[PDB]
Every structure is written in structure tokens, then in C-alpha cells.
Homo-oligomer: A and B are copies of this chain.
Amino acid sequence: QITTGSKELDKLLQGGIETGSITEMFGEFRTGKTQICHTLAVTCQLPIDRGGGEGKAMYIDTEGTFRPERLLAVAERYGLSGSDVLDNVAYARAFNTDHQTQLLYQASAMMVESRYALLIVDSATALYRTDYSGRGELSARQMHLARFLRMLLRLADEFGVAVVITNQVVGNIIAHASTTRLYLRKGRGETRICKIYDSPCLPEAEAMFAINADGVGDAKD
């Protein structure tokens, strides 16, 4: 399992994020999502005995919120080489769903070509909403979203990777495709609350977590 960077959020997840999975983390804006993604992108490169997946992260950025500075701040927390981390977090930025899907044509081929522990498509649902903004586009946007999810699930099952998609509450097949779902909601200061909203195995349960120079860390207070 890959560490979220919080042992207590990992204990809510019963050992951390799962290699061979799709995860969706959701609720309001600013509820951990991008900082979880940056933390995972680094920590997945750790030994499995150290709490990683022994492999690279793809980071598909839908939004421009990707930062090498936040990757370096997490790399040095775990004594990882900063510049190798910046290369092992394979960066690609997309303003739209067709380029997001073209980056899954690249990533489903390219993930053969190194050991990857993770793939991130941060804020994926925002591209669907801003590209398929015409209300009537329901069946097409849902089946493009289902195509995208099946490509991510192919990546998860084919490479044994954890796969990460993030959602701001502002389509529902994400809940079916997600192996554990996290309803992340508001906390106090840079602290935040995690709830497991859905898993077929794990119950409804909760944990506090923190956003620091650590990346994501335990909310010891």
C-alpha cells in the first residue's frame, strides 16, 4: 500500500492507498485533493517496506495546480532525491477532456515502460463540466467519462498501480468505479476531515488529517 503521508488517514484506509485500484476523493473545493495527489506522487516512489509502491507516478494536471516545489517539499521529508522525484512524477497538463484522454492513450502505453506505482488525474470532473457544459450532452459525457474510467481501470489492473481521480462538489459512475471513496470536508485551519463514504469492504468511518510543508501529514493537535 502507498502512504497518503498521514499514518492515521492510512489507518482509516487500513494500511494506506491500495496498489491495483481506482480511488476517488471528493467533497468541497480545498478538501485535501491536490495536496493528497502531490503527497502520493512522491510517496508511491518509496520501497513497499517504507510505505510506497516501488514506482513512478503519472500526474495528469487538468487545472494548472501542479508544482515541482510541493514535490520537492515531500521528497526531502522522506529523504528521496528531489530531481529524480521531479522526473519520476511524469508531468502532463491538459485544459480539456480530449487531451486528458489522449494523455491516457500515452499513459496506457508508457506505463508499460517503467515500474509505476501511481497515476493521478487531478480535478478530472471539472474538465467534463467545463467541456460538456450543454445540459443535453448527458449520454455522450457519461460514456466518454466511462471510457476514461475504463482506461484508468485498465491501467490499475494491467500495471498493479493505484489510480487517483479528484472531484470538487459544486458523473455518478465514478462511485461505481471507485474501490474506496473519500468524502473529504472542511476542518480547522490547514486541518481537514476525511470520511470513507463508500467501499464494498471498509465501513463508513472518519479521520482528521493535515496539510503542511510535510505535504499531507497526521493531524496531531
- Which B residues lie within 8 Å of A189 (CB)? 203-205
A206, closest chain B residue (CB): B170
Question: Once bound together, how far apart are the Cα atoms of A65 and B14, in whole Å?
Answer: 14
Contacts of A76 in B (CB 8 A): none
CA distance A190 to B30 in the complex (A): 29
Given contacts A176-B95, A205-B170, contact A63 B28 (CB under 8 A): no
CB neighbours (8 Å) of A63 from chain B are 199-201
The verdict on A157 contacting chain B, using a C-beta distance below 8 Å, is: yes
Segment of A39-47, A52-60, A125-133 engaged in the interface with chain B: A125-133
> Can you name the residue of chain B whose Cβ is closest to the Cβ of A143?
B133
Q: Using CB atoms, name the residue of chain B closest to A175.
A: B29
Q: Does any Cβ of B come within 8 Å of A168's Cβ?
A: yes
Q: Is B65 within 8 A of A203, CB to CB?
A: no
- Compute how far the CA of A168 lies from the CA of B177 in the bound complex, rounded to whole angstroms: 11
User: Is residue A198 contacting chain B, with contact meaning CB distance below 8 A?
Assistant: yes
CB distance from A43 to the nearest CB of B (A): 18
Contact with B along A168-188 (1 / 0, CB 8 A): 111011011000000000000
A34 within 8 A of B: yes
